[PDB]
């Protein structure tokens, strides 16, 4: 069966026909280890990123690209963020890059901030409930988004499959958090350009549209002071 | 000359200037992916020096990449004069339509580059995800040839580092595991004889 010819014939994207699309104690150990959710309204363009301390084990970076809406951030804006100044010497980044020039400019950003790309996580969008306008340079219909994983310093698949969200809904699939947390990378986790709707235990969320804040740098640091400084987020709490 | 054509050769040493211009180029190169090699790889410098630029004036390049070739392939694409304008991923399934480092890999990547100003192509007919069953190792899915034919029907195409199962109408396939030389396009036959009179490269 040729699902590409089938898409041409019917408008059902090939991913519509993927099927099926216990590490449960790990999920409970992650939940037990999670810091309280903390969050801060901040205009990241005008904000001294160095105020966010301590340095982070994981950064999830979700800048609002113009292609999500068909204040947006260009790759010019994003590339000038001083991410290396808040990343721990051994740390990870997950950068949502969209499906256009971001696949190139996001890799430039990663190298500029001192990371090497280790995984390319693809969010593949089905259209089972509505079997598309085109970017001028596009050759094909764009039905996916990429989240690049970078590493600096010394159970899951690289695919997320969900239905294409309703127009104007810019949310990324919550499954990205599951993937990240299952890596057991450390407990200092930062989500830049998060929203009220993405706030989550175990994470510090920083974004312009947050309606409330509870962030306190001293209180936050206290979650990771000894004996808790090097926990992976996947082990038991220390008595 | 529409029917399949091929040239057994080492792509490092063949003079590709004799083949003319193509609307679509596809390559699945043996990148040096800094792992143990079941085949002979091309060094980064050899990949960079590939005479890709002579093969097209206006058209599309499909470049399969993996590992750190995701970055090196972008470099080569740009050095050869292309802008990357799409990226196809092939989601690997079994016969039951289920998906087969830090993460398990369910997919393969194919960069799409454009050179010049192609006109008369059918952009946007297909989408950028392929779902298809895995055949042999290192074997790409036949769906890509259909997408490429719908995008540019009837034009001349060339595949680099192809294998005998890859030979198709409208395509000239170059690879070191093909069966001799098989050429039917008269312009190509002429320039081949002129450049290789004793039939050896
Ligand atoms: O290499 C390879 N398969 C041996 C050949 O023989 C065969 C037939 C023509 N090939 C040549 C190679 C050549 N020079 C090479 C050389 C160097 C040093 C000494 C001797 C020969 N010249 C003319 N044709 C190579 C090779 C290359 C790439 C891949 C992986 N992709 C398969 C992929 C497609 C979807 C999955 C994946 C892709 C990244 C996403 C696997 C194997």
């Amino acid at each position: 069966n040729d699902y590409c010819q089938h898409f041409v014939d019917t408008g059902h994207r090939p991913q519509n026909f993927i099927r099926d699309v216990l590490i449960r104690l790990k999920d409970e150990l992650i939940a037990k280890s999670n810091t309280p959710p903390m969050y801060l309204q901040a205009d990241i363009e005008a904000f001294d990123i160095r105020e966010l301390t301590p340095k982070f084990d994981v950064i999830l970076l979700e800048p609002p690209l113009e292609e999500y809406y068909r204040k947006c951030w260009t790759w010019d804006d994003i590339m000038k963020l001083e991410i290396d100044e808040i990343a721990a010497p051994r740390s990870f980044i997950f950068l949502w890059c969209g499906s256009g020039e971001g696949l190139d400019l996001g890799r430039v950003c990663l190298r500029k901030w001192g990371y090497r790309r280790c995984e390319d996580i693809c969010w593949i969008k089905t259209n089972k409930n509505n079997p598309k306008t085109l970017d001028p340079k596009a050759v094909f219909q764009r039905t996916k988004e990429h989240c690049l994983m970078g590493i600096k310093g010394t159970v899951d698949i690289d695919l997320i499959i969900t239905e294409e969200p309703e127009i104007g809904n810019i949310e990324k699939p919550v499954e990205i958090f599951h993937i990240i947390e299952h890596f057991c990378l450390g407990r200092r986790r930062l989500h830049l350009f998060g929203r009220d709707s993405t706030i989550r235990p175990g994470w510090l969320t920083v974004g312009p549209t947050l309606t409330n804040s509870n962030y306190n740098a001293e209180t936050y640091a206290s979650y990771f002071s000894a004996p808790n400084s090097y926990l992976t987020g996947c082990t038991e709490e220390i008595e | 000359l529409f029917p399949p054509q091929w040239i057994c050769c080492d792509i490092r040493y063949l003079d590709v200037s004799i083949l003319g211009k193509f609307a679509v180029v596809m390559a699945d190169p043996p990148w040096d992916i800094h792992m143990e090699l079941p085949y002979g790889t091309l060094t980064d410098d050899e990949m960079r020096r590939l005479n890709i630029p002579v093969l097209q004036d206006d058209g599309f390049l499909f470049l399969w990449v993996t590992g750190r070739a995701m970055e090196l392939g972008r470099e080569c694409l740009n050095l050869w004069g292309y802008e990357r304008v799409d990226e196809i991923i092939w989601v690997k399934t079994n016969q039951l339509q289920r998906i087969i480092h830090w993460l398990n890999h369910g997919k393969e990547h194919c960069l799409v580059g454009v050179k010049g100003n192609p006109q008369g192509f059918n952009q946007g007919l297909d989408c950028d995800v392929i779902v298809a069953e895995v055949r042999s190792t290192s074997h790409k899915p036949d769906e890509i040839y259909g997408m490429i034919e719908r995008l540019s029907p009837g034009t001349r195409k060339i595949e680099l580092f192809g294998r005998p199962h890859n030979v198709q109408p409208n395509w000239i396939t170059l690879g070191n595991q093909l069966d001799g030389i098989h050429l039917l396009d008269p312009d190509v036959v002429a320039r081949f004889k002129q450049r290789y009179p004793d039939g050896i490269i």
Side-chain angles (χ1 to χ4, degrees), chain A residues 110 117-120 148-151, chain B residues 70 102 105:
Chain A
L110 256 45
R117 191 206 41 86
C118 200
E119 296 303 341
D120 185 325
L148 303 186
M149 168 187 191
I151 181 175
Chain B
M70 280 192 226
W102 289 89
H105 287 173

Side-chain angles (χ1 to χ4, degrees), chain A residues 55-65 67:
Chain A
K55 312 226 178 276
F56 297 95
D57 303 301
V58 184
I59 299 178
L60 176 63
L61 183 38
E62 194 184 316
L65 310 180
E67 77 194 67

Side-chain angles (χ1 to χ4, degrees), chain A residues 55-65 67-69 72-89 91-115 117-129 131 135-153 156-165 168-170 172-189:
Chain A
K55 312 226 178 276
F56 297 95
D57 303 301
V58 184
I59 299 178
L60 176 63
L61 183 38
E62 194 184 316
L65 310 180
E67 77 194 67
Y68 299 161
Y69 310 89
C72 299
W73 281 59
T74 65
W75 285 101
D76 207 318
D77 300 316
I78 294 153
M79 191 170 344
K80 293 171 175 164
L81 291 175
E82 313 206 301
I83 298 294
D84 51 301
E85 294 305 322
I86 63 172
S91 62
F92 302 78
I93 186 163
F94 296 78
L95 171 67
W96 282 105
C97 290
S99 49
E101 67 183 351
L103 308 186
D104 311 303
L105 295 171
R107 287 177 155 81
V108 175
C109 288
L110 256 45
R111 290 188 298 265
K112 174 175 188 277
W113 302 324
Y115 304 92
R117 191 206 41 86
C118 200
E119 296 303 341
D120 185 325
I121 301 165
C122 279
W123 171 27
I124 284 161
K125 300 161 181 175
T126 61
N127 70 343
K128 299 183 217 195
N129 304 336
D135 160 350
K137 294 163 185 189
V139 183
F140 299 96
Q141 274 190 54
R142 289 183 180 161
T143 66
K144 47 155 179 78
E145 301 186 18
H146 298 245
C147 183
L148 303 186
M149 168 187 191
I151 181 175
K152 72 155 55 193
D156 280 301
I157 197 89
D158 57 356
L159 294 174
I160 303 172
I161 305 155
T162 77
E163 183 83 3
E164 171 130 350
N169 177 340
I170 41 78
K172 310 303 171 197
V174 68
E175 284 92 334
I176 191 64
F177 286 100
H178 304 181
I179 291 167
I180 291 170
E181 291 160 0
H182 294 158
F183 285 138
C184 311
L185 304 174
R187 303 169 64 241
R188 300 168 198 79
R189 314 194 191 101

Side-chain angles (χ1 to χ4, degrees), chain B residues 176-178 180-193 195-196:
Chain B
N176 67 357
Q177 274 156 18
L178 300 170
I181 296 141
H182 183 232
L183 300 168
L184 312 165
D185 184 341
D187 298 334
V188 173
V189 170
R191 300 194 287 264
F192 184 90
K193 288 206 261 233
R195 173 74 175 86
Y196 297 114

Side-chain angles (χ1 to χ4, degrees), chain B residues 9-12 28-30 39 41-42 65 161-162 175-177:
Chain B
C9 60
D10 195 309
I11 289 146
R12 302 179 272 176
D28 179 19
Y39 42 74
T41 56
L42 259 68
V65 298
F161 310 99
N176 67 357
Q177 274 156 18

